[PDB]
């Protein structure tokens, strides 16, 4: 579900917020994404 304030749980990574299609290139071994001050910013869908 996209574009709604949603409670998401990605492989144990729990959070609340809205999701948007990304344009950044994750490396194949990276699954999380952290900005400055260690705030979660991006995540990969485990299925697609």
């Amino acid at each position: 579900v996209k574009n709604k304030c949603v409670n998401f749980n990605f492989n144990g990574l729990t959070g609340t917020g809205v999701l948007t299609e990304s344009n950044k290139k994750f490396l194949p071994f990276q699954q999380f994404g952290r900005d400055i001050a260690d705030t979660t910013d991006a995540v990969r869908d485990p299925q697609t």
Binding site: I36, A37, D38, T39
Partner: protein
């Protein structure tokens, strides 16, 4: 005429002096940096 010429030369040199000086605008930058640093440390201290 001499006074007007001197004034014009000084005004013209002011902009070059501002551009060339590395720390001419130091105080405003320190204010901005201090505010940003306070916010950053406040946000990062939630992880403790």
């Amino acid at each position: 005429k001499l006074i007007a010429n001197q004034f014009n030369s000084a005004i013209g040199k002011i902009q070059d002096s501002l551009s060339s000086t590395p720390s001419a605008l130091g105080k405003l930058q320190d204010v901005v940096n201090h505010n940003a640093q306070a916010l950053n440390t406040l946000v990062k201290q939630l992880s403790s």
